[PDB]
């Protein structure tokens, strides 16, 4: 993710932007230690985010929703913002996916505590 403002926080379970650095790092976190962390079969990211929020309070629980797909372009291949565009309506089967973090605020850590998903 990349650096930014702080990120709205206000109290108790809120959905936050995309536009939200402390979703965006939470949304590359879950890719990353999903479908990166896993061996490549076939490529695949988090095409589109369907919903980003958080809990706000004595524990920080993540909820991020996803639809996943093969994606029709790789990692180091060019148009990264049009192969997912066109991932969406390839997309035969809508693969959907969720993802938490929780996040241990008091240590300043977090871990993936679920990580589902459909197959595209």
């Known amino acids: 993710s990349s ?3 702080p990120p709205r926080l206000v109290g108790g379970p809120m959905d ?6 402390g979703v965006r790092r939470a949304l590359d976190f879950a890719v990353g230690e999903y479908n990166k962390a896993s ?5 695949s990211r988090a095409l589109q985010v369907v919903r980003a929020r958080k809990q706000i309070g004595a524990g ?7 639809e996943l797909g093969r994606t029709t372009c790789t990692k180091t291949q060019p148009n990264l913002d049009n ?4 991932d969406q309506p ?3 089967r809508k693969a959907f996916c969720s993802f938490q973090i929780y996040a ?3 240590q300043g850590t977090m871990t993936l505590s679920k990580s589902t998903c459909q197959d595209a």
């Open 104 to 106: 241990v605020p008091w």
């Open 3 to 5: 650096p930014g403002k």
């Open 60 to 66: 920080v629980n993540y909820f991020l929703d996803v």
């Open 83 to 86: 192969c997912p565009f066109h």
């Open 16 to 21: 936050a932007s995309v536009e939200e650095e």
């Open 90 to 92: 390839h997309l035969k």
């Open 39 to 43: 061996n490549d079969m076939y490529h």
